[PDB]
Design a binder for this molecule. Structure first.
Ligand SMILES: Nc1ncnc2c1ncn2[C@@H]1O[C@H](COP(=O)(O)O)[C@@H](O)[C@H]1O
Ligand SMILES: [Mn+2]
Length: 336
């Protein structure tokens, strides 16, 4: 959701050597615009990277040349770009190119009204199993808002403390117990156990079904399956494996705090259910701009010889979380 939102032109700074364009700051994003398209304070529809914008030469002539066939529809995937050393992310169009939003307000999500959908990398061949049912409605999914979209929330949380973990580039995976049922899920579906299903294999490998059966509580262990043939196997692992990053308390419909999650992992491991965790870095006391957070995102991954996709920050009360994706990672890996 909110691929296209009405946002406010922030600081507008010139681009040396290029006089037809200039650099516009939209929340935490930097977005290249045609010169004089906006002034600071102007409103416009901002389209985030990963938006897919169906072909339309009169509304989106600036995307005419990057049109591709994507799930049977012709349009443009909005990706990170660096053109003359200037980072550029997203599309920012003045409001008067959208006469049907004339009465909308700043901050409105105009995604459906504009027909924007989301581009996604092809999901891994062996992570597409047999579906057993919907993703359980009593378990939260694992979406993380971007630090770029959280400027006022980054300031209100000044002084709060955050668990910092490495963001692993795999697939979201959930293993849960609710009363007399234990299932294994992908990002969007609960799956059937088969000999080839990867999620089920990684859950049997670390005995985490037996772990939830030992703990006797309604919990969802949420983590990332990574490894061979999963999103290009950044970490160069052999085989595939699950790395926990969250535990959802189903009965209380809230996530466990980081210390609760580490205590629960401790008791699992200690009882012979060794479930690995995404790498944990130093707790961070928040006193930063989004630019500063974004600058932290680059670094070593689980495999400390590769550059990580980014970092995830989870407040110590478990009630506020976000991710910061490394823009170097986005400029190196075009399928992200
Ligand atoms: N350390 C982490 N904490 C939270 N989520 C993570 C972590 N590492 C990887 N992820 C994945 O990153 C996703 C965040 O959104 P996305 O940018 O759509 O991949 C989550 O849904 C998880 O699948
Ligand atoms: Mn991901």
């Amino acid at each position: 959701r909110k691929l296209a939102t009405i946002r406010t032109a922030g600081e507008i700074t010139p681009i040396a050597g290029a006089e037809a364009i200039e650099c516009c700051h939209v929340d935490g994003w930097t977005c290249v615009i045609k010169k004089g398209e906006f002034k600071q304070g102007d409103r416009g529809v901002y389209f985030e990277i990963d938006s897919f914008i169906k072909e339309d030469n009169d509304r989106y002539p600036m995307l005419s040349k990057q049109v591709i066939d994507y799930e049977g529809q012709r349009g443009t995937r909005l990706r990170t770009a660096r053109l003359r050393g200037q980072l550029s992310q997203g599309l920012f169009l003045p409001m008067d190119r959208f006469p049907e939003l004339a009465s909308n307000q700043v901050g409105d999500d105009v995604t459906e009204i504009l027909g924007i959908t989301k581009w996604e990398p092809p999901i891994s061949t062996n992570l597409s199993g047999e579906i057993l049912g919907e993703f359980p409605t009593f378990i939260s999914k694992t979406d993380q808002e971007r630090v770029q979209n959280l400027i006022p929330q980054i300031e209100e949380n000044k002084g709060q403390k955050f668990e910092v973990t490495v963001m692993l580039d795999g697939s979201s995976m959930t293993v849960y117990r609710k009363d007399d049922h234990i299932g294994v899920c992908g990002r969007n579906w609960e799956l059937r156990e088969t000999a080839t299903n990867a999620q089920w294999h990684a859950a049997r490998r670390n005995k985490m079904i037996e772990g939830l059966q030992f703990l006797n509580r309604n919990l969802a262990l949420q983590g990332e399956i990574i490894g061979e043939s999963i999103q290009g196997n950044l970490e160069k692992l052999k085989g595939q494996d699950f790395y926990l990053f969250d535990i959802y308390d189903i009965d209380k419909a809230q996530y466990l705090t980081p210390i609760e999650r580490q205590s629960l992992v401790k008791q699992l491991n200690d009882n012979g259910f060794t479930v690995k965790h995404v790498p944990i870095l130093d707790d961070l006391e928040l006193n930063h701009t989004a630019e500063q957070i974004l600058a932290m995102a680059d670094g070593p991954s689980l495999n400390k010889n590769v550059k990580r996709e980014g970092l995830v920050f989870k407040r110590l009360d478990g009630k506020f979380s976000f991710k910061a994706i490394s823009n170097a990672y986005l400029e190196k890996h075009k399928d992200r």
